[PDB]
Amino acid sequence: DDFELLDQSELDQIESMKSTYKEEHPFEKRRSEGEKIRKKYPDRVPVIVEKAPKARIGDLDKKKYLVPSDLTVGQFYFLIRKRIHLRAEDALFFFVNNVIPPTSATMGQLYQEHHEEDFFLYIAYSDESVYG
């Protein structure tokens, strides 16, 4: 009948993606490490990469990556996929705040828009194209 007005704010209402890393490392320790690493490497951003709970592909043992601010999401996909156990026929998707980012985005763009108050950017991955 009538139009439905979609609002960007809806994206922000979803609950945060799971992060064992956040839960098991006290906030102040994370924030101190993130601030220090940002000062040390002004051309890089610190990223935490974790499996979405519903993902059906292999887990990732190493979570902490320091990435060039100009690396693109497509390049990051290549590098991270190399480290996960999945079939060539398995898919791989990344999520930042529950949303799949563009292949063309840079890690510095994602970091500026989405880093948390500990100065880390959190990315989840799944073989499914929805976070859960």
Residue numbers in the entry: 6 to 137
Give the exact sentences the study uses for this entry.
We also determined the crystal structures of GABARAP (a mammalian Atg8 homologue) bound to AIM (LIR)-containing sequences from the mammalian ER-phagy receptors FAM134B, SEC62, and RTN3 (FAM134B450–468, SEC62361–376, and RTN3245–264). Remarkably, all the AIM-containing regions of the three ER-phagy receptors are structurally similar to that of Atg40, consisting of the core AIM and its C-terminal short helix. The first and fourth AIM residues of FAM134B (F455 and L458) bound to the W- and L-sites in GABARAP. In addition, as with Atg40, the second AIM residues (E456 of FAM134B, E364 of SEC62, and E249 of RTN3) and acidic residues in the short helices (E462 of FAM134B and E370 of SEC62) interacted with R67 of GABARAP. In ITC analyses, FAM134B444–470 and SEC62355–376 bound to GABARAP-subfamily proteins (GABARAP, GAPARAP-L1, and GABARAPL2) with Kd ranging from 0.11 to 0.30 μM and from 0.19 to 0.57 μM, and to LC3-subfamily proteins (another subfamily of mAtg8s, LC3A, LC3B, and LC3C) with Kd ranging from 0.21 to 1.11 μM and from 0.92 to 5.18 μM, respectively, suggesting that these AIMs interact with mAtg8s with low specificity. These interactions were significantly weakened by mutations at E456 and E462 in FAM134B444–470 and E364 and E370 in SEC62355–376, as well as at the core AIM residues in these peptides, or deletion of the C-terminal helices (Δhelix). In addition, the interactions were also impaired by alanine substitution for R67 in GABARAP and R70 in LC3B. The mammalian ER-phagy receptors FAM134B, SEC62, and RTN3 interacted with Atg8-family proteins in a similar manner.
Landmark proteins called autophagy receptors bind specific targets and interact with Atg8-family proteins on the isolation membrane through the Atg8-family-interacting motif (AIM) (also called the LC3-interacting region, LIR). The core of the AIM is composed of four amino-acid residues [W/F/Y]-X-X-[L/I/V]28. The first aromatic residue and the fourth aliphatic residue bind to two hydrophobic pockets in Atg8 (the W- and L-sites, respectively), and the main chain of the motif forms an intermolecular parallel β-sheet with a β-strand (β2) of Atg828. Nonetheless, deletion of the short helix from RTN3245–264 reduced the interactions with mAtg8s. Thus, the C-terminal helix-assisted AIM/LIR is a unique structural basis commonly seen in the interactions of yeast Atg40 and these mammalian ER-phagy receptors with Atg8-family proteins.
